[PDB]
Amino acid sequence: ERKVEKLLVANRGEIACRVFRTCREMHIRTVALFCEAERNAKHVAEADEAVCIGPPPAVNSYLRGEHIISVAKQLNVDAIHPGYGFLSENASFADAITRSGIEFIGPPASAISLMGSKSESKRIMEAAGVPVVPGYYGENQNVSFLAEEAKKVGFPILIKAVSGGGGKGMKIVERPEDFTFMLESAKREATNFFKDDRVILERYVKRSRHIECQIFFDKHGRGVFFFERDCSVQRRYQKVLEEAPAPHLSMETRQRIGEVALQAAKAVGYVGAGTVEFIFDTSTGEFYFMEMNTRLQVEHPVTEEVCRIKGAPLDLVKLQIKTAMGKPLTFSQEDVTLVGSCIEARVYAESPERGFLPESGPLTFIREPFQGVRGPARTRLDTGFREGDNVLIHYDPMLAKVISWGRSREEALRGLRQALGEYKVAGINTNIEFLKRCCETPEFARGGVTTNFISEHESQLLKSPVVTPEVAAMAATAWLLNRCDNWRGAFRLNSDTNATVHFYIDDHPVEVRLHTEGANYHKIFFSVWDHDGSFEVCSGPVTSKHRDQKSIVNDFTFLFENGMHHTVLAVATEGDVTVIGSFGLHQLRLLPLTDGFGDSSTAGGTSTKIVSPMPGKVSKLLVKSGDLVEKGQVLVIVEAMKMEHPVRALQDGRVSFLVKEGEVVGGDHVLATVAEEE
Amino acid sequence: VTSKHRDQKSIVNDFTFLFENGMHHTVLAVATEGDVTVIGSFGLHQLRLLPLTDGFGDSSTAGGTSTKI
Amino acid sequence: WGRSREEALRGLRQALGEYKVAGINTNIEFLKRCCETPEFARGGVTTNFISEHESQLLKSPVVTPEVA
């Protein structure tokens, strides 16, 4: 075999840190890669050496496979792990690595190329004999052929069409012995949706739940399938929350899922770690092949919590290095046993209220949930970002992954709830509120959720706590104090103090007024939305005198008269005030009040504009008539004894020319009328 | 910036170097007048600074033939 | 300490490398040189084992122009 002492990573993020960590235990060197800048990132602070690769766009960075290979050769690298994304699925890169002599980590290039095309892949599995639900059989040569194979090839009837998602030819015709309505439905589908007259028939499944078993193989002909998984929950083809132990799955089935999976991988030949994905209908009770991926998934640490080998913790990445080592395995499929249950959820730096659009901004304060064992449950968090970091728009929005291992499902789900609640980030809106809403009200604790489970409950979700009038009181107070000495040393005569804050909550401005009575800075009141009360407030140490973009992060205490007390860590800026406490997190936008403060001119500008002196001789006018002029460009240039003396009018609005180039004009002539755009 | 007093221990600071080829490095350097010590993935190396001291002032090669004391 | 000799020897290598002292020259570079090239991982070394391999040892990495 070939010794390995240097490890190379392609991608960046959580996978970089994960690959780097175990490496320490195996006592192997590490190498990091980073784009323009991106040098303060954590992963590079974790490796032994890092190299800059070039411009931010993914074409420029992490796609120059030849340059990466040349750099690795110069470094005499032993192994490369592509990870997921970028060159994860590219057979040319793997072949070039093999020619260079470096041990590529993953499947051979032949398997990747074969699975690149869906038609040839499904051909291979059909030849292998695995139950596969195909996409098409022939064409609509005859309408009687539809009745011929309707009860033949596939009893379930999937009429549909050659293409297009309209699918009005379907009509949900699950009843066999249908011969006068299927042809009428197809012919009415052909109208206004002719496309190609060829029609394909398949089996139609009422329900769908996604399954995906894991597999592992050495290069000495020996492997063992890991435990199954579930990915029923996904929105817009994006993974949201998943469970390694498919609840409600019989043991016997588990076993069989393996025999089918091993047949397919052996047929194409496979080395390393991979995952086979199925599609399943509860009503039919059978699973049909949909797709496979020849690449390590992102969901690898999840399935790990439900599998132990020889009573020892399993490390998936470890074996992949050992597989690259050339050593053979040590365990049969038997040594592996499941223990308990676990659940996972992904947090995305997106805004749930909006069109789930990514946002980029500095990370102000990041609470870290307790990543230790307690009670009947294990909870962990893996994050590829830390304090002081900033999200890049080029990358996908992905902060951290939270997993709750437990002895029973209940324990696991309950654990997450509390953890999901505890983790807190300030600075960018996240979908963390959405995930908690997905966990509390939906009765998916039973364990039965379909592929389209998210679609129906969209009305129930997308809901957040209501900002109580009290929340404005602590939020408003923090912005003042966390900016200046408002209410500090203040003093007037025979009167009392007053200071107000305007919040632009939703599309309606909000005003909050704060004032004091007595000689007390401590005793304070409030009146928001016609609700009045009293409270006292005690601050903490003063921090962040520089009041930069991060501004001031301080803890606050508020004793309201009723009797309560509160603690609030407020990082306030001019743009917004963020308050985090037992209520949760809420950011209140401050009413924006900016509008070219100075240049606010509504003057008509009717006549006598950019008038030229006596000599005249206007020429070389470079402004189009009827075009807005707010900045002071040279509207007209007139020459008086070689005196260009450009007028440079700054009156806003479009300018209308009444003169032409080369025309001698009199003194103080109306060359143009600079009027407000009407 | 650390160790303004620049005593015998002098200044211990971390450094980053981005060379054009593409690499990057981190180096904790405790430097003194006698030597510069750099520790990093290369290992440890101390480089002695060329000594340049020789009774700066009293450097007289005069013959001193006669008329002394 | 290790479950097998290999693990133990390999462990030290990395540790010996990691420990760092600044201020006085040490023989830590020598010990690592005593561990890498000499094929004493087999386990058979005599009392005079150090004497014969003195040419091989006493060797340190070359200061590259970048280090300056």
DSSP strands (E only) in A218-340 = 230-235, 238-243, 272-280, 287-293, 308-309, 312-313, 336-337
Closest CA to A431 of A230, A210, A239: A239
Residue A201 structure tokens: 């028939």
Closest CA to A133 of A208, A231, A243: A208
Count Cβ atoms below 10 Å from residue A214 Cβ, excluding itself. 25
Determine the length of chain A.
678
3-class DSSP state of A347: strand
Chain B nearest-CA distance from A52, in A, is 5
Q: Are A217 and A322 in contact (CB under 8 A)?
A: no
Assess C17–A contact: CB distance below 8 Å, yes or no: no
Q: Are A67 and A53 in contact (CB under 8 A)?
A: yes
- Residues on chain A touching C12 (C-beta within 8 angstroms): none
Burial class (CB in 10 A: 0-12, 13-18, 19+), A255: exposed
- C7-25 burial: b if 16+ Cβ within 10 Å, else e: eeebeeeeeeeeeeebeee
3-class DSSP state of A602: coil
CA distance A591 to A330: 65
Assess A52–B contact: CB distance below 8 Å, yes or no: yes
DSSP strands (E only) in A281-396 = 287-293, 308-309, 312-313, 336-337, 341-347, 365-366, 377-383
A479 Cβ contact list (under 8 Å, min separation 6): A501, A572, A577, A590
CA distance A128 to A131: 9
Q: Quick one: closest CA in B to A51, which residue?
A: B23
Assess A175–C contact: CB distance below 8 Å, yes or no: no
CA distance A197 to A145: 14
- Structural element, H or E, at residue A31: strand A29-34
Handedness of CA A243, A248, A252, A253 (dihedral sign): negative
What DSSP designation does A47 have?
A: S
For Cα atoms C26, C31, C37, give the angle at the middle one, nearest 5 degrees. 140
Residue A282 structure tokens: 């509860």
3-class DSSP state of A56: coil
Total beta-carbon pairs less than 8 A apart between chain A and chain B: 21
Closest CA to A234 of A345, A339, A327, A372: A345
CA distance A108 to A113: 9
- A65-100 burial: b if 16+ Cβ within 10 Å, else e: beebbebbeeeebbbbbbbbbbbbbbbebbbbbeee
- A4-41 burial: b if 16+ Cβ within 10 Å, else e: bebbbbbbbbbbbbbbbebbeebebbbbbbbbeebeeb
Chain breaks in chain C (C to N over 2.5 A) after: none
Closest CA to A242 of A494, A435, A12, A17: A435
CA distance A100 to C62: 28
Q: Best residue in B15, B39, B44 to probe C by mutation, most C CBs within 10 Å? A: B44
Output the domain CATH number for residue A449: 3.30.470.20
Strand A50-52, strand A29-34: pairing: parallel
Q: Rounded to a whole number, what is the largest CA-CA distance in chain A?
A: 103
| Long-range contacts formed by B29-35: CB under 8 A, 24+ apart | B30/C22, B30/C23, B32/B8
Residue with tokens 């209501």: A466
- Structural element, H or E, at residue B37: strand B35-40
Chain B nearest-CA distance from C55, in A, is 22
Strand order in the sheet with A287-293: A287-293, A272-280, A209-217, A230-235, A238-243, A341-347, A400-406, A377-383
User: Tell me, what amino acid is at A37?
Assistant: A
Strand order in the sheet with A308-309: A312-313, A308-309, A336-337
What DSSP designation does C67 have?
A: T
Count Cβ atoms below 10 Å from residue A556 Cβ, excluding itself. 20
CA distance A535 to A523: 6
Count Cβ atoms below 10 Å from residue A444 Cβ, excluding itself. 17
- Residues on chain C touching A27 (C-beta within 8 angstroms): 10-11, 13-14
Residue A349: alpha-carbon gap to chain centroid: 6
Helix axis angle for A91-100 and A65-74, nearest 10°, is 20
Cα–Cα distances in angstroms (integers) from residue A382 to residues A84, A440, C13, in the given order: 17, 23, 30
CA distance A546 to A468: 32
Q: Are A441 and A423 in contact (CB under 8 A)?
A: no
CA atoms within 13 A on the CB side of C50: 6
- Structural element, H or E, at residue C15: helix C5-18
Can you give the resolution of this entry in Å?
A: 3.4
Active-site positions of A read: 295
A268 Cβ contact list (under 8 Å, min separation 6): A110, A111, A114, A115, A124
Closest CA to A472 of A349, A591, A592, A593: A591
CA distance C35 to C9: 8
**Residue C2 — φ and ψ, nearest 5°?**
-155, 165
Cβ contact (<8 Å) for A39 and B23?
no
Burial class (CB in 10 A: 0-12, 13-18, 19+), A270: buried
CA distance A669 to A586: 61
For Cα atoms A583, A587, A592, give the angle at the middle one, nearest 5 degrees. 150
Residue A217 structure tokens: 């193989």
Burial class (CB in 10 A: 0-12, 13-18, 19+), A344: buried
List chains touching C (3+ CB pairs under 8 A).
A, B
Cβ contact (<8 Å) for A51 and B25?
no
Assess B46–C contact: CB distance below 8 Å, yes or no: yes
Cα–Cα distances in angstroms (integers) from residue A270 to residues A109, A221, A292, in the given order: 10, 9, 12
List chains touching A (3+ CB pairs under 8 A).
B, C
Nearest to B39 among C22, C29, C68 (CB): C22
Closest CA to A606 of A653, A659, A668: A653
Handedness of CA C2, C3, C4, C6 (dihedral sign): negative
Q: Best residue in A5, A30, A40, A49 to probe B by mutation, most B CBs within 10 Å? A: A49
- Residues on chain A touching C10 (C-beta within 8 angstroms): 27
**Residue A231 — φ and ψ, nearest 5°?**
-130, 45
Taking chain C, what is the end-to-end CA distance rounded to the nearest angstrom?
A: 38
For every residue of A649-677, DSSP letters joined together read: ----SBEEE---TT----TT---EEE---
Count Cβ atoms below 10 Å from residue A406 Cβ, excluding itself. 22
Strand A672-674, strand A655-657: pairing: antiparallel
Strand A552-560, strand A531-538: pairing: antiparallel
Closest CA to B43 of A38, C44, C62: C62
Assess C14–A contact: CB distance below 8 Å, yes or no: yes
Alpha helices of A138-246 — where are they, by DSSP H?
Answer: 143-150, 182-190
CA distance A660 to A617: 10
Chain A nearest-CA distance from B42, in A, is 10
3-class DSSP state of A17: helix
CA distance A23 to B3: 36
Burial class (CB in 10 A: 0-12, 13-18, 19+), A485: exposed
Q: Quick one: closest CA in A to C18, which residue?
A: A27
| Three-state SS annotation for A239-267 | EEEEECCCCCCCHHHHHHHHHHHHHHHHH
Q: Is C58 left (phi over 0), alpha (psi -120 to 50) or beta?
A: left
DSSP strands (E only) in A506-548 = 508-515, 523-528, 531-538
Nearest to C67 among B19, B30, B42 (CB): B42
**Residue A302 — φ and ψ, nearest 5°?**
-70, -55
Residue with tokens 């032949």: A110
Alpha helices of A55-108 — where are they, by DSSP H?
Answer: 65-74, 91-100
Burial class (CB in 10 A: 0-12, 13-18, 19+), A254: middle
Q: Is A608 left (phi over 0), alpha (psi -120 to 50) or beta?
A: left
Assess B37–C contact: CB distance below 8 Å, yes or no: yes
Q: Which domain holds residue A268?
A: 209-457
Q: Are A223 and A329 in contact (CB under 8 A)?
A: yes
Handedness of CA A440, A444, A447, A449 (dihedral sign): negative
CA distance A542 to A482: 8
Q: Rounded to a whole number, what is the largest CA-CA distance in chain C?
A: 43
CA distance A504 to A475: 13
CA distance C29 to A22: 27
Q: Are A427 and A363 in contact (CB under 8 A)?
A: yes
| Three-state SS annotation for A95-160 | HHHHHHCCEECCCCHHHHHHHHCHHHHHHHHHHHCCCECCCCCCCCCCHHHHHHHHCCCCCCCECC
Q: Are A495 and A557 in contact (CB under 8 A)?
A: no
Residue A9: alpha-carbon gap to chain centroid: 22
Q: Quick one: closest CA in A to B25, which residue?
A: A49
- Residues on chain A touching C11 (C-beta within 8 angstroms): 27
